[PDB]
Write an enzyme that holds these catalytic residues in place. Structure first.
Site, PDB file in Angstrom:
ATOM      1  N   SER A   1       0.787  -1.226   0.000  1.00 21.75           N
ATOM      2  CA  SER A   1       0.000   0.000   0.000  1.00 21.75           C
ATOM      3  C   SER A   1       0.822   1.280   0.000  1.00 21.75           C
ATOM      4  O   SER A   1       0.232   2.349  -0.224  1.00 21.75           O
ATOM      5  CB  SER A   1      -0.937   0.025   1.203  1.00 21.75           C
ATOM      6  OG  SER A   1      -2.057  -0.801   0.932  1.00 21.75           O
TER       7      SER A   1
ATOM      8  N   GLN B   1     -11.002  -5.155  -0.426  1.00 23.74           N
ATOM      9  CA  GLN B   1     -10.434  -5.977  -1.480  1.00 23.74           C
ATOM     10  C   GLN B   1     -11.380  -6.050  -2.666  1.00 23.74           C
ATOM     11  O   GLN B   1     -12.595  -6.185  -2.496  1.00 23.74           O
ATOM     12  CB  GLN B   1     -10.153  -7.396  -0.966  1.00 23.74           C
ATOM     13  CG  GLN B   1      -9.160  -7.462   0.193  1.00 23.74           C
ATOM     14  CD  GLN B   1      -9.650  -8.372   1.321  1.00 23.74           C
ATOM     15  OE1 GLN B   1     -10.800  -8.266   1.766  1.00 23.74           O
ATOM     16  NE2 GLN B   1      -8.784  -9.267   1.782  1.00 23.74           N
TER      17      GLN B   1
ATOM     18  N   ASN C   1      -8.784  -0.891  -1.084  1.00 28.84           N
ATOM     19  CA  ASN C   1      -8.131  -0.949  -2.389  1.00 28.84           C
ATOM     20  C   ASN C   1      -9.094  -0.629  -3.527  1.00 28.84           C
ATOM     21  O   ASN C   1      -8.688  -0.045  -4.535  1.00 28.84           O
ATOM     22  CB  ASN C   1      -7.533  -2.337  -2.628  1.00 28.84           C
ATOM     23  CG  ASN C   1      -6.334  -2.607  -1.773  1.00 28.84           C
ATOM     24  OD1 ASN C   1      -5.683  -1.688  -1.289  1.00 28.84           O
ATOM     25  ND2 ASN C   1      -6.026  -3.886  -1.582  1.00 28.84           N
TER      26      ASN C   1
ATOM     27  N   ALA D   1       1.749  -3.397   2.983  1.00 30.41           N
ATOM     28  CA  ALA D   1       1.999  -4.810   3.164  1.00 30.41           C
ATOM     29  C   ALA D   1       1.564  -5.570   1.928  1.00 30.41           C
ATOM     30  O   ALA D   1       0.644  -5.164   1.215  1.00 30.41           O
ATOM     31  CB  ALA D   1       1.284  -5.348   4.423  1.00 30.41           C
TER      32      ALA D   1
ATOM     33  N   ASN E   1       5.810  -9.587   6.373  1.00 26.38           N
ATOM     34  CA  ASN E   1       4.721  -8.682   6.763  1.00 26.38           C
ATOM     35  C   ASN E   1       4.566  -8.775   8.278  1.00 26.38           C
ATOM     36  O   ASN E   1       3.853  -9.636   8.794  1.00 26.38           O
ATOM     37  CB  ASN E   1       3.430  -9.052   6.042  1.00 26.38           C
ATOM     38  CG  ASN E   1       2.238  -8.220   6.499  1.00 26.38           C
ATOM     39  OD1 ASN E   1       2.398  -7.199   7.163  1.00 26.38           O
ATOM     40  ND2 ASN E   1       1.029  -8.647   6.117  1.00 26.38           N
TER      41      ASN E   1
HETATM   42  C1  LIG Z   1      -2.156 -11.788   4.319  1.00 26.84           C
HETATM   43  C2  LIG Z   1      -2.068 -10.570   3.395  1.00 26.84           C
HETATM   44  N1  LIG Z   1      -2.078 -10.608   2.009  1.00 26.84           N
HETATM   45  C3  LIG Z   1      -1.974  -9.257   1.476  1.00 26.84           C
HETATM   46  C4  LIG Z   1      -1.957  -8.948   0.090  1.00 26.84           C
HETATM   47  C5  LIG Z   1      -1.857  -7.625  -0.311  1.00 26.84           C
HETATM   48 CL1  LIG Z   1      -1.825  -7.194  -2.041  1.00 26.84          CL
HETATM   49  C6  LIG Z   1      -1.776  -6.604   0.635  1.00 26.84           C
HETATM   50  N2  LIG Z   1      -1.656  -5.222   0.193  1.00 26.84           N
HETATM   51  S1  LIG Z   1      -2.962  -4.133   0.394  1.00 26.84           S
HETATM   52  O1  LIG Z   1      -2.798  -2.996  -0.521  1.00 26.84           O
HETATM   53  O2  LIG Z   1      -4.221  -4.744  -0.064  1.00 26.84           O
HETATM   54  C7  LIG Z   1      -3.087  -3.552   2.116  1.00 26.84           C
HETATM   55  C8  LIG Z   1      -4.290  -3.733   2.789  1.00 26.84           C
HETATM   56  C9  LIG Z   1      -4.424  -3.308   4.104  1.00 26.84           C
HETATM   57  C10 LIG Z   1      -3.348  -2.704   4.740  1.00 26.84           C
HETATM   58  C11 LIG Z   1      -2.144  -2.518   4.072  1.00 26.84           C
HETATM   59 CL2  LIG Z   1      -0.786  -1.733   4.931  1.00 26.84          CL
HETATM   60  C12 LIG Z   1      -2.003  -2.952   2.758  1.00 26.84           C
HETATM   61  O3  LIG Z   1      -0.776  -2.782   2.082  1.00 26.84           O
HETATM   62  C13 LIG Z   1      -1.794  -6.905   2.001  1.00 26.84           C
HETATM   63  C14 LIG Z   1      -1.890  -8.238   2.417  1.00 26.84           C
HETATM   64  S2  LIG Z   1      -1.937  -8.969   3.911  1.00 26.84           S
END
Ligand SMILES: Cc1nc2cc(Cl)c(NS(=O)(=O)c3cccc(Cl)c3O)cc2s1
Length: 351
Positions: A61, A117, A149, A308, A333
């Site tokens: 993000s 999402q 997002n 993340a 993460n």
């Molecule tokens: C187990 C996980 N799988 C993923 C996959 C993605 Cl792509 C992201 N990126 S995010 O753009 O949607 C995102 C969402 C909320 C907070 C932050 Cl700080 C963030 O960057 C975070 C995670 S956590």
């Protein structure tokens, strides 16, 4: 590398890496406008590749700061306005709940409950249209903030339509290239794969998977050197020679909404400096107060963004009035409070 910077960085980051079991990490401190770099550990555990100043990390993000600035640049060019209805750039979006939802609401997560999402089943442009047509807002526009997002990602896709460029080509031509971010990518080229760190989730090596609006919401990969340059650009936008980009950076740091102690920019989030470190959840819905009109970028601010992906954790924070900043890139993460605590210890020591 002044010994004070060396000491505070190493004494903060070494135990952080040990407690969070971070495989590899890169840090950049911007002090009085100059960058200093630090690296630890492994970009690729199995192949024993170290983290270097050229290692690419998934920003997650933190990519939204790039999207916010690109949107700012399109505003400064006169191609879009944040007061424009969403339907002005997507006339196929005919469902009645979109009446009154503006580009500003998309950019700042205030459209009325767009979800965090985009669903995995949504791939095509027609899939995306259908998803947004069917979405039912829980709230009126401009009353509550829900980080999403699907909100700022749609803002990014729409903001580049008048340019005629693809989102990636607009970002390259209008942001990366003018700022000399020559090792920052939405798609990592084969020539750069040797530098692309692996992320680690549950001990398994992982890279971010393709998704709808991924480039716009969480799609950027970058080195610690380019991210230091990004912080320098956002600290002193007036040194930038491209006029609309200078203005776009300033617009992304304007304060549009307040919730608690935080102010929402375009991508960036801000608090008043000096900040209580304790003032800096899958779903957190918060009422917002409009800032009417938005406050222009306040030099006395803690400006920051966490990011993340499944395998990566990033953080950027800077204080314009002190010419001070930090970037922390890791290929695990790990919890956001630990990032902010480490960043505050370092910047507070140096301010
Ligand atoms: C187990 C996980 N799988 C993923 C996959 C993605 Cl792509 C992201 N990126 S995010 O753009 O949607 C995102 C969402 C909320 C907070 C932050 Cl700080 C963030 O960057 C975070 C995670 S956590």
């Amino acid at each position: 590398a002044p010994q004070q910077i060396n000491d505070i960085v190493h004494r903060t980051i070494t135990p952080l890496i040990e407690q969070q079991k971070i495989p590899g990490m890169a840090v950049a401190v911007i002090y009085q406008g100059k960058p200093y770099y630090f690296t630890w550990g492994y970009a690729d555990i199995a192949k024993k590749q170290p983290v270097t100043q050229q290692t690419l990390f998934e920003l997650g993000s933190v990519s939204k700061t790039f999207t916010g600035v690109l949107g700012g640049d399109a505003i400064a060019r006169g191609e879009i306005k944040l007061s424009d209805p969403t339907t002005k750039y997507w006339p196929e979006l005919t469902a009645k709940q979109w009446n009154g939802i503006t580009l500003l609401h998309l950019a700042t997560y205030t459209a009325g409950g767009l979800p965090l999402q985009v669903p995995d089943e949504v791939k095509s442009s027609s899939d995306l249209l259908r998803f947004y047509q069917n979405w039912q807002p829980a709230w009126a526009p401009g009353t509550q903030r829900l980080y999403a997002n699907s909100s700022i990602g749609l803002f990014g896709a729409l903001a580049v339509k008048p340019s005629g460029l693809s989102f990636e080509q607009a970002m390259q031509t209008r942001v990366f290239q003018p700022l000399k971010l020559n090792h920052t990518w939405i798609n990592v080229p084969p020539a750069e794969e040797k530098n692309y760190a692996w992320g680690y989730r549950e001990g398994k090596a992982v890279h971010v998977s393709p998704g709808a609006l991924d480039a716009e919401a969480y799609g950027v990969k970058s080195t610690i050197e380019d991210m230091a340059r990004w912080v320098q650009s956002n600290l002193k936008p007036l040194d930038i020679n491209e006029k609309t980009l200078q203005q776009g950076i300033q617009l992304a740091q304007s304060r549009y909404w307040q919730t608690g102690d935080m102010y929402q920019g375009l991508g960036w989030e801000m608090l008043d400096w000096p900040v209580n470190p304790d003032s800096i959840i899958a779903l957190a819905a918060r009422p917002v107060k409009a800032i009417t009109p938005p406050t222009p970028a306040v030099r006395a601010s803690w400006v920051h963004k966490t990011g993340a992906t499944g395998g990566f954790g990033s953080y950027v924070a800077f204080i314009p009035e002190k010419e001070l900043g930090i970037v922390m890139l890791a290929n695990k993460n790990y919890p956001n409070p630990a990032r902010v605590d480490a960043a505050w210890q370092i910047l507070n020591a140096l301010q």
